[PDB]
């Protein structure tokens, strides 16, 4: 067993962290006070779930997690929420004033006041680890803290933990639930600074989640809570291999080995099915073939894009529920004849499959119906670069006029960092075209 430490930065990172850890507790039978009756080794253990939970002598199972935000509103709700007993107070770190949607404020002005404290609190968790393998970092692209502080933290983690893997769960900005007009700026700035420090990043486009909630959960106006419960199901599906018995994706290094053959192209596309409303009174349970075929519909993807016009470098199928390999293989055989699945010439055309027999867990009172089988596909396809093209174009429109740039220069940033960041994004799009076209 090797421990993983989760770090949740900014509002989006914290609130998605709340949803994930709530889901983790329900999946492992951990009560809101941290007690887990099924855990028979009191006060310690090396079980698979101990990758995410340490244990106190009193039998309390505490998340290996740090929450960071530059203002206190969001984390205070964790301090007073249903799972307030779950977290030790030093795991919840707040400042007094946020980055005001400004990467420069979160990265330079304010983040510099709190970075040493956060690393100290992170080091406390690492000292409880017998074999720490790395970090899972949750944050938004568009927020000043989620963008600016995260990139500062990731640089320092490379310094302090040079041989530890770092994975990201990143919220890609969407106008439907946007909070700032400068979110394209923050996204490009943080991607440039973080690119070398992240081994694998799962981007979630709020536009995709918003539309999935509208179309499949019949929610007219999805809230953050609607989005985050869906996101946490996909995150839990992705991390399940670290928390349960299995042979596939058993350590952070395996995510990079299995999904990322080239370091800069480390943004796998997640696709999840089925998403079914709890309110739907009559539902026909979807077969292995149906949920597997749904993995190749852009409407079910975490980012809207067309994988038919890109190339695959790796493909992982993560099933939960009533699924046996024979049916997966039959489903894959049919799907391959009828769909456009092109791998690069230097990679084999193959799927790595993991099956957990437990069907997905749903939060009581939530919007997701209970299903007998579900799947999350992780594919590394060049088609995800469409998201970079969209982001870089919005960046270009504003930066050509230097609109809003003075807010960043005023915090000590230089105009040269904008174009240096933009050149790196330009190189990233070129990398994706060379591999995919």
């Amino acid at each position: 067993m090797r421990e993983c430490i989760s770090i949740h930065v900014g509002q989006a990172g914290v609130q998605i962290g709340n949803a994930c850890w709530e889901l983790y507790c329900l999946e492992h039978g951990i009560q809101p006070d941290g007690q887990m009756p099924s855990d028979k080794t009191i006060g310690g253990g090396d079980d698979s779930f101990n990758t995410f939970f340490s244990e106190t002598g009193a039998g309390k199972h505490v998340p290996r997690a740090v929450f960071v935000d530059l203002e206190p509103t969001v984390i205070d709700e964790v301090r007073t929420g249903t799972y307030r007993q779950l977290f030790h107070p030093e795991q919840l770190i707040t400042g007094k004033e946020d980055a005001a949607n400004n990467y420069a404020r979160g990265h330079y002005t304010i983040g510099k006041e709190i970075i040493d404290l956060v690393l100290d609190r992170i080091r406390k968790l690492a000292d409880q680890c017998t074999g720490l393998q790395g970090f899972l970092v949750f944050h938004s692209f568009g927020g000043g803290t989620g963008s600016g502080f995260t990139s500062l933290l990731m640089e320092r983690l490379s310094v302090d933990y040079g041989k530890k893997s770092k994975l990201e769960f990143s919220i890609y900005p969407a106008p439907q639930v946007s909070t700032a007009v400068v979110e394209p700026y923050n996204s490009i700035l943080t991607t440039h600074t973080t690119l070398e420090h992240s081994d694998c990043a799962f981007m979630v486009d709020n536009e995709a989640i918003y539309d999935i909630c509208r179309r499949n959960l019949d929610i007219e106006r999805p809230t953050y809570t609607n989005l985050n419960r869906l996101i946490s199901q996909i995150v839990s599906s992705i991390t399940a291999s670290l928390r349960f018995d299995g042979a596939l994706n058993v350590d952070l290094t395996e995510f990079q080995t299995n999904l990322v053959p080239y370091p800069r192209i480390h943004f796998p596309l997640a696709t999840y099915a089925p998403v079914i409303s709890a309110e739907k009174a009559y539902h026909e349970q979807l077969s292995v073939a149906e949920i597997t075929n749904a993995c190749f519909e852009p409407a079910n993807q975490m980012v809207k894009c067309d994988p038919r016009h890109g190339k695959y470098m790796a493909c992982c199928l993560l099933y939960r529920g009533d699924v046996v390999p024979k049916d997966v293989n039959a489903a894959i055989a049919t799907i391959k004849t009828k769909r456009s699945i092109q791998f690069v010439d230097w990679c084999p055309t193959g799927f790595k499959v993991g099956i957990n027999y437990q069907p997905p867990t749903v939060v009581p009172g939530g919007d997701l119906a209970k299903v007998q089988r579900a799947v999350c596909m992780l594919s590394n396809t060049t088609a995800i670069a469409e998201a970079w093209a969209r982001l870089d174009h919005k960046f270009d429109l504003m930066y050509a006029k230097r609109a809003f740039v003075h807010w960043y220069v005023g915090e000590g940033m230089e105009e040269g960092e904008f174009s240096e960041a933009r050149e790196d994004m330009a190189a990233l799009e070129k990398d994706y075209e060379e591999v995919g076209v």
Partner: protein
């Protein structure tokens, strides 16, 4: 399709299907940059305060 490396346990199983074969900065330089941006803030503020003093 070739099914390889099938591993089974009580919790589930995993395998791989093949359809076709193939064909960082130091701490000092971080503090360098955090301090160079801070001095640019202090310079811009000192210029404002010099302007307000005139």
């Amino acid at each position: 399709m070739e099914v390889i490396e099938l591993n089974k346990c009580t919790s589930g199983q995993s395998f791989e299907v093949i359809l076709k074969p193939p064909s960082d900065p130091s701490l000092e330089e971080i503090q360098k940059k955090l301090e160079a941006a801070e001095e640019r803030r202090k310079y811009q503020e000192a210029e404002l305060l010099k302007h307000l003093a005139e």
